[PDB]
Nucleic acid binder design. Structure first.
Lengths: 121, 118
DNA sequence: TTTTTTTTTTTTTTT
């Protein structure tokens, strides 16, 4: 445990996905799926509050977590968690991306069900 | 402020540029710098590499104290939220607003004083 | 394995 003496970086962002999961599989047979999460919130800074809006291009790679994505529709309310990585050198400016290791959905069943059975009788 | 909406980034690395310390016409001291992260990771044994220069701002009186101590080369960890503005040309910029700092220099300084206090 | 240049209706924060 020597270099991990400055390798700590975890981002936890909840948000609604605005770009559907674009799946692909790289040569080694690994499957990955991207999308753009839109996060919006009120954040307090300096004893006051201000809005925090951001589009985070997240991507989930490898087997374990592919399933949970096949289940994330557009306008999904999710919280993703994993490391951040980026780059924008003037010889190929790529972008900031949250490689995800973990995701749980944030709209409760009792919640959504409400909006599926009520209009009727 | 509870609910779904949660934004927490906890980055570490070596302060690249600055820090530029200004007090703005609103009253508060603002300290801005850029943090250069570099690390290797992923679950079991698949090797991914990580790098990123996160513009950081430390806004308010509360945290400007610990600040007069970080300079280019300074290693620290910061925790706070990420917001994204327009820029001066390129649309969205990302900035981590630090709500909590950690000079990992004091970490070594504390581990040492332990290993060596006869 | 070149920090796998991978922003694919008007570029989501400007309705």
């Amino acid at each position: 445990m020597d270099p991990n003496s400055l390798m700590t970086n975890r981002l936890v962002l909840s948000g609604t996905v605005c770009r559907a999961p674009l799946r692909k599989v790289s040569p080694s047979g690994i499957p990955h799926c991207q999308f753009v999460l839109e996060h919006r919130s009120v954040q307090e800074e300096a004893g006051f509050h201000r809005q925090a809006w951001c589009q985070m291009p997240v991507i989930v790679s490898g087997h374990e977590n592919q399933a949970i994505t096949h289940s994330i529709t557009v306008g999904s309310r999710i919280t993703v968690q994993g490391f951040i990585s980026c780059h924008k050198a003037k010889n190929g400016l790529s972008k900031m991306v949250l490689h995800a290791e973990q995701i749980e959905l944030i709209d409760s069943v009792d919640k959504l069900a409400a909006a599926l059975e009520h209009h009727h009788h």
